[PDB]
Amino acid sequence: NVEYPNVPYLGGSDIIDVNNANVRVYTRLPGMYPAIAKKIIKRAPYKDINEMLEKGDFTAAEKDILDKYLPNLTALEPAPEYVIDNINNGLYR
Amino acid sequence: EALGIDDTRLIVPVILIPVITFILYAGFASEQDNEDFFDTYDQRR
Amino acid sequence: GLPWYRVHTVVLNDPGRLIAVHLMHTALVAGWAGSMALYELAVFDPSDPVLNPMWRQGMFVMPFMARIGVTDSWGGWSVTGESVANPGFWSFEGVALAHIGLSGLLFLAAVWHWVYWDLELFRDPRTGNPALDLPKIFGIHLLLSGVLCFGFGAFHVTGAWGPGIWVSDAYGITGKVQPVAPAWGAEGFNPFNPSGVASHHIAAGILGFLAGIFHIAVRPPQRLYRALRMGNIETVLSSSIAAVFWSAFITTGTMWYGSATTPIELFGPTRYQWDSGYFQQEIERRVENSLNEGLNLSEAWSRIPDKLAFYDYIGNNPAKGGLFRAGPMNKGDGIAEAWLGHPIFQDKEGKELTVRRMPAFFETFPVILVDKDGIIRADIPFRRAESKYSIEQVGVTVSFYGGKLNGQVFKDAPTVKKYARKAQLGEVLEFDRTTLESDGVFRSSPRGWYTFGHANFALLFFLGHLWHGSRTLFRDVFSGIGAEVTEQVEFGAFQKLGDRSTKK
Amino acid sequence: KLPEAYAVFKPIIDVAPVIPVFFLLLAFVWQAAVGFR
Amino acid sequence: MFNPTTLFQLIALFLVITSGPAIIVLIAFRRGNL
Amino acid sequence: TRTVPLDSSGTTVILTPEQVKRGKRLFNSSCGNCHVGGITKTNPNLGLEPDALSLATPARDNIDALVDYMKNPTTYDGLESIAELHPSVKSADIFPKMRSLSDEDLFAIGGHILLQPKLSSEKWGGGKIYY
Amino acid sequence: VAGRDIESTGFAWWSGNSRLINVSGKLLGAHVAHAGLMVFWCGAMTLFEVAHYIPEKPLYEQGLILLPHLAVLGWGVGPGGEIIDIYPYFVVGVLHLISSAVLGFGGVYHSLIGPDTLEESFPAFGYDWRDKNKITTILGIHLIVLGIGAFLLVIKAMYVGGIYDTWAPGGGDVRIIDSPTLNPGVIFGYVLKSPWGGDGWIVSVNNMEDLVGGHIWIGIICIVGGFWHIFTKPFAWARRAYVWSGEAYLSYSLVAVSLMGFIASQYSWYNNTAYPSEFYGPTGPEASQSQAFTFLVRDQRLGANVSSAQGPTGLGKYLMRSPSGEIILGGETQRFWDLRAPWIEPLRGPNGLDLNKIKNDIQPWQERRAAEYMTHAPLGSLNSVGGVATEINSVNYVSPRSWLTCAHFFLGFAFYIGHLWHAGRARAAAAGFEKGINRENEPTLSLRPID
Amino acid sequence: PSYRTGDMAVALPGLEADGGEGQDELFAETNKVFQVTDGSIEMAFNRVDGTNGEFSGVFVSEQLSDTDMGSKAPKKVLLKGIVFGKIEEQ
């Protein structure tokens, strides 16, 4: 769409929004790729962060990484234009 | 698929038309002399 | 028989019918001038000279009428925006009707000279053949042109007996026809000094008058007569075409680059005023001077005239049009209604941002916002790409100072994107689109169209000059060569090439 | 790599492929020597 | 500068490039049917 | 420049020009087909840009980390090994071009990888945009 | 000296080989010397590629085109396309070099000091171009020689060590071909197959059994036809049809070998059976499908549902549907869905790629092959820079398939041009107006005006 | 889902100068909206295999067509074909 206010969190800022961003934005955070982020993208829709921490099948070390990356991580309303492109998104460089 | 032929009715014209053209050409050739020559080409028609 | 491309060579040795066809061409040109003026008066809108001047409406001969005095109309209006109670005869309509009558008179004269071709004046008293004493004719015409140039520059331009020429200020705000005193120093060769016009015409008229006296008085040398083929009129044609395309190149340059003879209130601004930020620098200087007097931004930007902000706009750039985007400039972006004011773009932290202006090369330019340092702080994505510095993310807000939207602050993203896309083009204006059904692609000014037409005409007349010089210097071998060429083309047969007396 | 018994003859093997081009140039030189009769 | 592999390259190239012209020159010296 | 970090503590080593040239040649011969320009043609989510190497577990912004990756490559998280998929001296039988690289060769390759961000900056790992 | 100038032959120095048309012995010398040149290039380039061979890199990464030709035939090749010994390549090169010395001596002898015309000294070898019987005898002898060569290939493939079959289970190995396809239906349905996409005419031979069986057929046909031409003279229709002169025969050969050049270029570009990708490298279709297949594997293994991933246009991003209804790889590689490769056919069901076999039946060597082929795609430049034309000068790779295909397409077109030139001149010289129009009797002046 | 996946009138720079209202006539075409329409599927099983988990029959589908990302009216599509599936262990 022409107008979309919830797109500084698709990799343009520090805070990363789930269920609307590609797997490439988890490469900025060490230890969040290609593991962990796979669990985030597979079970995409979340209400907030705690829903991701509970519904995701995260092991204790993965939970330690999640505890390492609380503040640069959020969960907003899902947009189907970005849900369908959370694995490839057409970016390759 | 030989010669792109999938139906056997397609073979009837492909074989038949050259036969008729060969019949006309064979009349023409039977009108000819048809003995060997020693030249680059045959000037007899 | 004659080919189709040689049908006019029948008047080459017929002076009476040569004068007749010249009269017919002159009548056609004068009639075109009159009819073009009448059509432009039919399609001209004199209501708003500030935001809809004559160059926005595609007027072509109206600028040339307004350049040297004719500014009023019988309808009661002037191109300066004033009201004229008593227009007088020499209005736009008066000039057009005078040109139509002149065309008719020249047409009748052409008829007479075509019928009465065998005048005794055109026959040589010595030989009896139809001949023209071209050097003395050139002397007479040079004397006449010197008299006309001196009179124009001494009475018309100076206002001694005449209206003067169009003189504007440095930024095209207050321009009118004024008497012009000549400048005889080196400052008369400043092309943006209108005093140079008067001084040039006076001095060149005097020199041309003296040279015409000389050319009437003195016969040409035999070496120059044989070398330049002065008995043949095609050398006159060749040299005249050469001088004409020289003059066409000169006028093309002075139109494109601008001079005092091509003011921006008649032909529009130049592309180099947009490239250098001429009007932008002037507007910023005025705003800074008003801010130094204790005014706030609203009062400083409200003091900027609408004409000055209208000049600082890329739609008025002559280098933004198209070859086949025909029509007036109002057929493009539209008819300008109002100046919306200067947009100032602020992010969520209050830092000011300026949209980078579109260069004249680019049909489309990406919308990017830079800070005072020059770093990209916000932009608009291309069409649908994932973004990092978008307008919605940075939260860019735009506040307008001056103009119609003075004091208003827009914070919603679609409006901010719209106004940033407008500010990419320069000053933000309001355009009317339903009057002429404007498509939305920029069109060139009369300055640009004049430059295009006359550059191409000069380039083609260079070829014409080459052709006629060739036909002049090679008249004896026009239909081909003979058997006297075979001996000359032998290598080393003669010492000097082409000379039979230098045989080895 | 060549076998070590013949590895010292590598430069000749490197020169060898372009020799037919030298044969073409040799034909041209031979025609130059007879004056292109 | 001086490499035995490069030296042998240049020697072999010189012999190859001068064998044929040597044939032509020697045939021209013996006044053969060149 | 010729000075790249060596250890994870902050130790730096000054590379000889012969090492730089040999590392450039070996990187263009053994890694170029998949790491032209500092990017990855087969996994474009990761690259040889210093930000991607530094923000990794373990961080590959030093000589020893790069040599260890060339000896035992792991995933970006580090828990899973990719020695079957990525060339390594452990998998030199899998990838035949690795069988000629020694420890000094890996040292030169790592020095070239660390040395390129300081040569024509923003073009190493920036893809076709910075060409 | 008469016969070697323009005053005695009518041909200039730049057309001096046409002075050999009626000089049979010197023509034989020229042909034998040229054969020596060809064998010399074979030996010299074979030894050059042996000397430049790096045991670590594959054959297609080193710019070698003759070592792959020997690797097809099973010399020094282990299982999986591994080059284990290059000594037989050296043997081939040295044998060709010595044979080229012999052939060059023969060519020089017959060109310079042998008899100019063989028709009086050795009548069994002398000939006239207009004598159809002797020319057909020579043609039959050469046909039987070619049949013997084809049977040499057959003997190599069936008895002497075998040839490299890239379709052998496990990843390809040198295999004795014991049951060649002698069925004329298959062999001549290859010949009558369409040359367009999905069929490929005879470029689409996908197993060594068909190759060996049809080479048996070619040898039998060539030998039978050679004896046929040794014992017969052309029929009356053939005598009326063709021009009987040396230049006409040359033009016929030129068009035949031009067609062969085109066909070999397409063999090198598309076929991966007679041109295995372990040696010549992957084809363009093979490289694109390798890239798509490796991405498919990396997304099926690392958590991405490839069969339900909608692309940017609503089509398949990884797996899509073919125009004939099969499951093929999605993306821009959908045009290359006709690819058959030994590393993908075990993973291919009756409806295309079987998803269950993709997720279950992958052998690791197929992973290695697909990971190797996806990087060295046949895209290069004349200055040998790898990748697309918008790449930097750091990759040095142009595929041998590209070199062979471009060179032989160039030569096929050039020899079609030569065929047209020589056929036109043969007709004009037979009719007798190859030197220009006769001024005394111009054919056009004796015709009625056309309008 | 929409037929296509994921802000200017690039053609007309003079259209975005009108003042206050620029390129707003060509806004719905510019605003490519990802629209997820809904549909209903009804399938019946004509024959069911007992040895395996296979079933066969016909299906009737009703859904919407391309929206041009929210630029054209979605026409409803009626699809009546055949269906097959296997039921086994999860």
Ligand code: CLA
């Ligand atoms: C494949 C290349 C090739 C071959 C095999 C031939 C062969 C021949 N050409 Mg020829 N030619 C060629 C290319 C070739 N040409 C090209 C490219 C041109 C254009 C420049 C010509 C132009 C040309 C003309 C104008 C004429 C010939 C003629 C001849 C014939 C007589 C040769 C002669 O008397 O030379 C004598 C040459 C020499 C004595 C010097 C060369 C000595 C040898 C051959 C050099 C090579 C030796 C070798 C390196 C050592 C091998 C020995 C072995 C033991 C290892 C001969 C059959 C003539 C002909 O038609 O005769 C009737 C003739 O008039 N040619």
Ligand code: CLA
């Ligand atoms: C088996 C192949 C073969 C054979 C035996 C011949 C034999 C002959 N040709 Mg021939 N030809 C061939 C292939 C062949 N050609 C091909 C493929 C072409 C198309 C390019 C031609 C084009 C051709 C022409 C145009 C002519 C001959 C001529 C001749 C006769 C004299 C040749 C001579 O003295 O050369 C002397 C050799 C040279 C001077 C060396 C020249 C080296 C060239 C310039 C290298 C550059 C080639 C260039 C890159 C190719 C262009 C691109 C291509 C696509 C066209 C002789 C009967 C001539 C003749 O009189 O016929 C009776 C003649 O005029 N041929």
Ligand SMILES: CC1=CCCC(C)(C)[C@H]1/C=C/C(C)=C/C=C/C(C)=C/C=C/C=C(C)/C=C/C=C(C)/C=C/C1=C(C)CCCC1(C)C
């Ligand atoms: C399309 C085209 C071709 C390529 C070049 C270019 C792109 C520039 C473009 C230019 C085309 C050209 C050359 C157009 C020419 C237009 C012209 C010459 C128009 C002129 C028309 C003349 C007119 C009305 C004259 C009217 C005069 C009248 C009643 C006089 C009447 C009278 C007479 C006859 C006797 C006395 C009394 C009175 C009343 C005065």
Ligand SMILES: CC1=CCCC(C)(C)[C@H]1/C=C/C(C)=C/C=C/C(C)=C/C=C/C=C(C)/C=C/C=C(C)/C=C/C1=C(C)CCCC1(C)C
């Ligand atoms: C045994 C050994 C172990 C490992 C090392 C090593 C590789 C060196 C190897 C050594 C191999 C050796 C010594 C091979 C010997 C090779 C030889 C002598 C090759 C030469 C063959 C000669 C040839 C074709 C010549 C043919 C003649 C031609 C065209 C003449 C054509 C022409 C003539 C007839 C008229 C004029 C125009 C022209 C074009 C010149």
Ligand SMILES: CC1=CCCC(C)(C)[C@H]1/C=C/C(C)=C/C=C/C(C)=C/C=C/C=C(C)/C=C/C=C(C)/C=C/C1=C(C)CCCC1(C)C
């Ligand atoms: C099956 C397969 C897999 C891989 C390897 C293997 C060799 C086995 C391969 C092929 C095996 C076989 C049996 C291949 C057979 C190929 C054949 C029969 C090729 C023959 C092509 C015939 C051609 C051009 C004919 C050309 C003649 C033409 C136009 C006409 C000539 C003339 C006539 C007769 C009519 C008028 C015009 C003219 C010029 C006077």
